[PDB]
Amino acid sequence: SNNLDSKVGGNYNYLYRLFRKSNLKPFERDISTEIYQAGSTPCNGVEGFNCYFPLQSYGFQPTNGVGYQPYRVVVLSFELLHAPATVCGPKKSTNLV
Amino acid sequence: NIVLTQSPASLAVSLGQRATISCRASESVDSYGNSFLHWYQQKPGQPPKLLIYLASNLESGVPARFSGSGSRTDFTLTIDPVEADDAATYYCQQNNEDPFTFGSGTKLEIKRADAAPTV
Amino acid sequence: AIYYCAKNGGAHAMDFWG
Fold first, then answer.
1. Does C14 touch chain B if contact means CB atoms closer than 8 Å?
2. Where do the record's region annotations for Receptor-binding motif lie (chain A)?
């Protein structure tokens, strides 16, 4: 996704958390989605004059190596319930017997 | 007002050597993931340019001879090998504490090969 | 002295110069 998400100067919008106080449940999204600052005044975008994110950021540069470019990862999870199956594929193409 | 004592003041170096440019500072540390400052190169007859910001990220326009590391308070700019583009003054920029003071400056001179004047 | 102007960068540095 170097031609999709990255830009000129580097994309520092994707970060990760070093340690979490609470525990995580399966199929649960973190409600803390707001980007906080280091002080009290928000910066609304780029960093400057002590508004840094305490979380660690990734290095997403357009001139970076093949092992450090931003890669969009989509994890295809699967589960089964009491309801019948609905999503399945692929099944090519047009057989009948 | 923190007077960033930069050592040395002036030293004429030659090609293929290793120059030591030390910056003394105390503030600050742990911006977001590091505690380094900015480095610049100010020529007396040319507008300056940014060598490397925060001493850990990539930036074009700088030669490969500018590198180094430092502690949480003191820093060291290492020029190795010295090329014929170091006739300038170097400074360190405090980027966290107001006022954003600078270093004293290291005026390096180039001891290149001999050259005849234009006739 | 020869004064210069510069704009603020992304990591609070002087990236732009005239």
1. yes
2. 1-71
